[PDB]
């Protein structure tokens, strides 16, 4: 049937995948050792998109772990989730690229790219309904940028027509770690425009704002930030892993949300995202959280949504939701005038309601709420998020700082110049279409 493959490249690929595949074992009733208990067969209704069958219910994830460094991969090969994954699906590196492009685009990647594309083809030949790709990466990583652009340069030659999905983290304009992240974000945007269907972005700080105010988590780290992103990942798959009245597959997401083949970069949002106590004193209706979707304390990228112009807003609901107030509240959004559209698209809405409510992680900070919304809103606030990063790249480039690492690794300096004219017209097209 339909079967979807996931690829995890970089350390952000490692631990986000350590949460998403951890979460899916809860939502299908699969024990982490590798087999299933017999009670979760009725829950296991069309789980075939990720898990091959082996011998007696033993379910390997159709997932590939790619890293140039063996350290964080051994965390998978130490914990409980060691026996779940397949060993020859784990392909490790030895020498690190250290957030450098040609160290991750030519040096260690080209010794390992031929090993992993076989493991792509070894697994994908079982498919008769191969839909899409979950590729997880960063923007400033050596293998996060240098290998990811090269990997998407090769799978479009192989499979082409079949879809792709990229999840990543938007680098914050104020608080971020690596100094080469303004460099590599221009590099990972250069040749991945042509080789990616859609790519999503989240902020470190925009997670933190709801963590401190609504979750009331005043000591967050990369443990709980992986759980919050994984709920957004799981809510997309709920249209596919279960039987809904009006649901949507991966080819349909890009068909609605891509108005032009270059501007295809929306973001995410999730609500209700609060702690376990505040849901007790409040009855969260449909009109409650849907109006909570379109306020700037709910976006997952810290920018100005009111200074952006909405073009195609996508909505996926979960839980037992009636469509009457849905057909009212989205109309009640249209009664408000602050939600600005473009003049040519009034019909940029998507309706999706699944029967299954989201189930929370065990021992987590969330609360069991029936209603939830995964808001996807492509807008022109991405252009205002382009200018904050195009300011960082050029001024460090003008003094030619940190160029002496990019030179000797098999890389040219004129490629920095061509990406400048490439990204200049990109943020222009938000204002040209808008």
């Amino acid at each position: 049937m339909r079967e979807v493959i996931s690829i995890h490249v970089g350390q952000a690929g490692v631990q986000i995948g350590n949460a998403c595949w951890e979460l899916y074992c809860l939502e299908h009733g699969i024990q982490p050792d590798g087999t299933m208990p017999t009670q979760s067969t009725n829950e296991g209704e069309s789980f075939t998109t990720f898990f091959s069958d082996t011998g007696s219910g033993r379910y390997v994830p159709r997932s590939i772990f790619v890293d140039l460094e063996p350290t964080v991969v051994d965390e998978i090969r130490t914990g409980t989730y060691k026996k779940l994954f397949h060993p020859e699906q784990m392909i490790t590196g030895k020498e690190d690229a250290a957030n450098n492009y040609a160290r991750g685009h030519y040096t260690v990647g080209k010794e390992l790219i031929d090993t992993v594309l076989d493991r792509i083809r070894r697994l994908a030949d079982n498919c008769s309904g191969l839909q899409g790709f979950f590729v997880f990466h960063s923007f400033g990583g050596g293998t996060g940028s240098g290998f990811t652009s090269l990997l998407m340069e090769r799978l479009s030659v192989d499979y082409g027509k079949k879809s792709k999905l990229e999840f990543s983290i938007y680098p914050a304009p104020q608080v971020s770690t690596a100094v080469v992240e303004p460099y590599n974000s221009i590099l990972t945007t250069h040749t991945t425009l042509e080789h990616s269907d859609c790519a999503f972005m989240v902020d470190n700080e925009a997670i933190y704002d709801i963590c401190r105010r609504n979750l009331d988590v005043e000591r967050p780290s990369y443990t709980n930030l992986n759980r919050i992103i994984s709920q957004v990942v799981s809510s997309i798959t709920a249209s596919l892993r279960f039987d809904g009245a009006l649901n949507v597959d991966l080819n349909e997401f890009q068909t609605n949300l891509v108005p032009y083949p270059r501007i295809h970069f929306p973001l995410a949002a999730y609500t209700p995202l609060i702690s376990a106590e505040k849901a007790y004193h409040e009855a969260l209706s449909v009109s409650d959280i849907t109006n909570s979707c379109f306020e700037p304390a709910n976006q997952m990228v810290k920018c100005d949504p009111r200074h952006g112009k909405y073009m195609a807003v996508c909505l996926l609901y979960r839980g037992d939701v009636v469509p009457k107030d849905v057909n009212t509240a989205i109309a009640a959004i249209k009664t408000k005038r602050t939600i600005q559209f473009v003049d040519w698209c009034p019909t940029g809405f998507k309706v999706g309601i699944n029967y299954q409510p989201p189930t929370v992680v065990p021992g987590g900070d969330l609360a069991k709420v029936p209603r939830a919304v995964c808001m996807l809103s492509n807008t022109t606030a991405i252009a205002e998020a382009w200018s904050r990063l195009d300011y960082k790249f050029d001024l460090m480039y003008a003094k030619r700082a940190f160029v002496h690492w990019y030179v000797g690794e098999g890389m040219e300096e004129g490629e920095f110049t061509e990406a400048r004219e490439d990204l200049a017209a990109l943020e222009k097209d938000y204002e040209e279409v808008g």
Binding site: V72, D74, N99, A178, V180, Y222, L225, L395, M396, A401
Partner: protein, 426 residues
């Protein structure tokens, strides 16, 4: 896998590691016999990076011990952790440099360089892919500043690819330690700006000012001054030896910091630092450990941090910490101290967090900074170097060895171009 040798040369760097290997021994649960006694295998899963296990678990440190005399050999050998080192590596001469560069470089060091060159080759043949070298020596004396100077000029012939850590002490403005101390500085840095990747300019003077105020210790033992050098170096390589939420190898520490192929002269910092009785009376918060890192007190060199600009801030934090409070305050220092940074380089903070603190604390911070007030370190020595060349004193200890007069002036021109490059962006 990723493998690093540690080489000591000269009387300074030979006794720095002698306390430094002890902490590396104690952070991984081994013995002077090399017997692993770590309870959790977290102390074993990256034991291979500094060790070569052979014949029932007696781990030998990947260490080379070089001297021009047998004086410093037996003291390390009969001293603490003397049974741990491999006796194959005990290569030495019978001269002594006598604080003379051309003896350590041309005359006597040219004899003993061939023996350990194969020893550099031998342990590098038994590995899959080397990673980089770390070197402890001196810049004031004659043995390490003359012999370890020439060693870097032959590593690049073997391995022109990897990184070179050259940790060495530097002169102080207050009291000179040796007589030819400005001669041992300009002639060494002439070769250090050619083929090295990082130097940590640690002043001997300011280490007492750390101990006199924080530690309040009236009796500075030389085991204790290198002990503060020991905990600095172990915090740098914590990513290669321990897991965490964000790992950062020595090359990532290299590539984030050095902007131009000369300006790689960094000073280190460490927090917390205090005496015994002030433990409970202060706070172990992210905010208290933040502002200690950016004080003139924590400056291990005797240069003034408000007389320069931080270019690349490296925050190697150790311990179970909240990431957002790290994300909070590293923003807050630039909202306070925007004059204290270089202006045209945005987001000057680089953060690497391992979730394992060092032994003896609960939360620590390993700082390495790039102030452009380290320009004054090469301002003060270029005058003392040109204080005695104007009278041509001590020339019969160098030209009598066969040193060129142009060898002074070629180094003297490249010394003065170095402070022009800090001036370029200040």
């Amino acid at each position: 896998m990723r493998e690093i040798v540690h080489v000591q040369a000269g009387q300074c760097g030979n006794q720095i590691g002698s306390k430094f290997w002890e902490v590396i021994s104690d952070e991984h649960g081994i013995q002077p016999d090399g017997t692993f006694k770590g309870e959790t295998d977290l102390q074993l899963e990256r034991i291979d990076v500094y060790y070569n296990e052979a014949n029932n678990g007696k781990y030998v440190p990947r260490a080379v011990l070089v001297d021009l005399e047998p004086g410093t050999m037996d003291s390390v050998r009969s001293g603490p952790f003397g049974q741990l080192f491999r006796p194959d590596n005990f290569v030495f001469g019978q001269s002594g440099a006598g604080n003379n560069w051309a003896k350590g470089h041309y005359t006597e060091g040219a004899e003993l360089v061939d023996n350990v060159l194969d020893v550099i080759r031998k342990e590098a043949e038994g590995c899959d892919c080397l990673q980089g070298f770390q070197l402890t020596h001196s810049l004031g004396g004659g043995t390490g500043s003359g012999m370890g100077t020439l060693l870097i000029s032959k590593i690049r012939e073997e391995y022109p690819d990897r990184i070179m850590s050259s940790f060495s002490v530097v002169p102080s403005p207050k009291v000179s330690d040796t007589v030819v101390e400005p001669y041992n500085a300009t002639l060494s840095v002439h070769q250090l700006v050619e083929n090295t990747d990082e130097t940590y300019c640690i002043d001997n003077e300011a280490l007492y000012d750390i101990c006199y105020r924080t530690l309040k210790l009236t009796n500075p033992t030389y085991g204790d001054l290198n002990h503060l050098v020991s905990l600095t170096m172990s915090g740098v390589t914590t990513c290669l030896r321990f897991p965490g939420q964000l790992n950062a190898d020595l090359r990532k520490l290299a590539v984030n910091m050095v902007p131009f192929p000369r300006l790689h002269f960094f000073m280190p910092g460490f927090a917390p630092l205090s005496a015994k009785g002030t433990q409970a009376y202060r706070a172990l918060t992210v905010a208290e450990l933040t502002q200690q890192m950016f004080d003139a007190k924590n400056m291990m060199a005797a240069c003034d941090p408000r007389h320069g600009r931080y270019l690349t801030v490296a925050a190697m934090f150790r311990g179970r910490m909240s990431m957002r409070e790290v994300d909070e305050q590293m923003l807050n220092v630039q909202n306070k101290n925007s004059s204290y940074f270089v202006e045209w380089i945005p987001n000057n903070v680089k953060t690497a967090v391992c979730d394992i603190p060092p032994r003896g604390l609960k939360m620590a911070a390993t700082f390495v900074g790039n102030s452009t007030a380290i320009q004054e370190l090469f301002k003060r020595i270029s005058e003392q170097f040109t204080a005695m060349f104007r009278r041509k004193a001590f020339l019969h200890w160098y030209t009598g060895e066969g040193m060129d007069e142009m060898e002074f002036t070629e180094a003297e021109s490249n010394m003065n171009d170095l402070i022009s490059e800090y001036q370029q962006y200040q």
